[PDB]
């Protein structure tokens, strides 16, 4: 209990200070693309998020999440279950046995999609992917099936949870903070709060902390829920080694860094530079909009006759007496617009703004998915590969384990029960 | 053995007598350096504008 000796509360606080730069980046990144996605801690229910002066970031961010969504999670299968009972003997010996086995993998793979289909997992992944673009990190929790009841994932924003990693890339400890009303607390959680003592109003919310840490003696994750500084009785559990439901996801992975960095952070500077140029362009037109009649005082013309006169009225005066104030900055407007247009060009390619590459075509096919997958590797570095290993592979493994209990695989051996999982471009398409 | 060592150092641009390889960008790094300076002033003049 060396990691958890201080408790969930204390371990959360010190590690929270580690993530303070990251939430600062996400708020800054969101401020320019979409201020609503990552809101500050202070502002709530009266925020009135001011729109960014440029919409390139907002338009690109929505495009970025959608493009990743099409390739990572299409209606076509995105996990491949490859059966290898032996490394080489499986093909040599018992070939027809493989066909019976390979038939089982198809149904197990099929029931995964049905499991995805029933519980609406696709909706939460889009939010997670969008959080990944604007914020470096997001955590996805897959609750236990608990029967046939509807079971969505819980998505933890970077503000809610915390994580500690070594330069190895492994996770030492993670804590998630959840604030739930007393009446809405799980029944096991409620009796612990009542067992702790002190009357609590129903609308009053009690924060809960779930701390997962590596046991120093054995490489197995240990999970427990702590409420008001008290551990929940019966909540203690040992997650299978490297199979914890929590999936910490980093879009960009850097060495010796526990968190990850947002893709927008790569182009935040070009984003804020466009913010400044577009802001001045709009403000320039605001000055130009206002009408001011500059009457030459030495002139004959008097404004009183001009205003009182009806339409088509002869008024004593001279046209050159009356003039209007105009914003003469034309060279500045054309150079700023020229530079602003250039900055949009570099951001358009980085964010892959639509150029009829994917908008064309009214049908969704596996062929288009592979086109997007190739495009997602041409730009965005290799996040398509990175997310496939970091997100798809853990996501399938946890679901595969749960579906073993629900559906009994006809073949007893665990290798046939748990085939090797391929979540790359090989999964897209029939094969 | 040498042929079976799992520690694989791979050098992309090899030069004789050098233990380490060199990057492809380094030959254009002197060129990206000139490009960035030009684009740096172009945006900064717009900031005045």
Curated annotation (Swiss-Prot), chain B:
Location(s), subcellular: Virion
Endpoints of the signal sequence: none
Disulfide feature: none
Function: Forms the portal vertex of the capsid. This portal plays critical roles in head assembly, genome packaging, neck/tail attachment, and genome ejection. The portal protein multimerizes as a single ring-shaped homododecamer arranged around a central channel.
Subunit structure: Homododecamer. Interacts with major capsid protein. Interacts with the tail tube protein gp11. Interacts with the terminase large subunit. Interacts with the internal virion protein gp14.
Family under the similarity heading: Belongs to the podoviridae portal protein family.
Name of the protein: Portal protein
Biological source species: Escherichia phage T7
Span covered, complete protein: 245 to 293 of 536
């Amino acid at each position: 209990t060396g990691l958890a000796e201080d408790g969930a509360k204390s371990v959360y606080e010190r590690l929270k200070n580690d993530r303070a730069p990251y939430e600062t980046r996400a708020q800054n990144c969101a401020q320019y693309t979409i201020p609503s996605l990552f809101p500050k801690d202070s502002d709530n229910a009266s925020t009135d998020y001011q729109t960014p002066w440029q919409a390139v970031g907002a338009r690109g961010l929505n495009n970025l999440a959608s493009k990743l969504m099409l390739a990572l999670f299409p209606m076509q299968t995105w996990m491949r279950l490859t059966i290898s009972e032996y490394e080489a003997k499986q093909l040599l010996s018992d070939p027809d046995g493989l066909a019976k086995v390979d038939e089982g993998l198809s149904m197990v793979e099929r029931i995964i999609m049905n499991y995805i289909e029933s519980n609406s997992y696709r909706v939460t992944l889009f939010e997670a992917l969008k959080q990944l673009v604007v914020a470096g990190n997001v955590l996805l929790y897959l609750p236990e099936p608990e029967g046939s009841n509807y079971n969505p994932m819980k998505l933890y924003r970077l503000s809610s949870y915390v994580v500690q990693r070594d330069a190895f890339g492994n996770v030492l400890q993670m804590v998630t903070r959840d604030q739930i009303a007393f009446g809405a607390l799980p029944e096991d959680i409620r009796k612990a709060v009542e067992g702790q003592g002190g009357e609590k109003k129903a609308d009053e919310t009690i924060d809960v902390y779930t701390h997962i840490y590596l046991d120093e003696d054995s490489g197995e994750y240990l999970r427990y829920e702590e409420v008001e500084g008290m551990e929940v009785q019966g909540s203690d559990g040992t997650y299978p080694k490297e199979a914890c439901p929590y999936i910490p996801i980093r879009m960009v992975r850097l060495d010796g860094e526990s968190y990850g960095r947002s893709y927008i952070e790569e182009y935040l500077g070009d984003l804020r530079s466009l913010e400044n140029l577009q802001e001045a362009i709009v403000k320039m037109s605001m000055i130009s909009s206002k009408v001011i009649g500059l009457v030459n005082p030495a002139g004959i013309t008097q404004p009183r006759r001009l205003t009182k006169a009806q339409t088509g009225d002869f008024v004593t005066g001279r046209p050159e007496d009356i003039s209007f104030l105009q914003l003469e900055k034309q060279a500045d407007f054309t150079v700023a617009k020229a530079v602003s247009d250039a900055i949009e060009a570099r951001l358009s390619f980085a964010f892959m703004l639509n150029s009829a590459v994917q908008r064309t075509g009214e049908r969704v096919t596996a062929e288009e998915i592979r086109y997007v997958a190739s495009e997602l590797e041409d730009t965005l570095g290799g996040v398509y590969s990175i997310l496939s290993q970091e997100l798809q592979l853990p996501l399938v493994r946890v679901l595969l384990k749960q579906l073993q209990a629900t559906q009994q695989i006809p073949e007893l051996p665990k290798e046939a029960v748990e085939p090797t999982i391929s979540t790359g471009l090989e999964a897209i398409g029939r094969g």
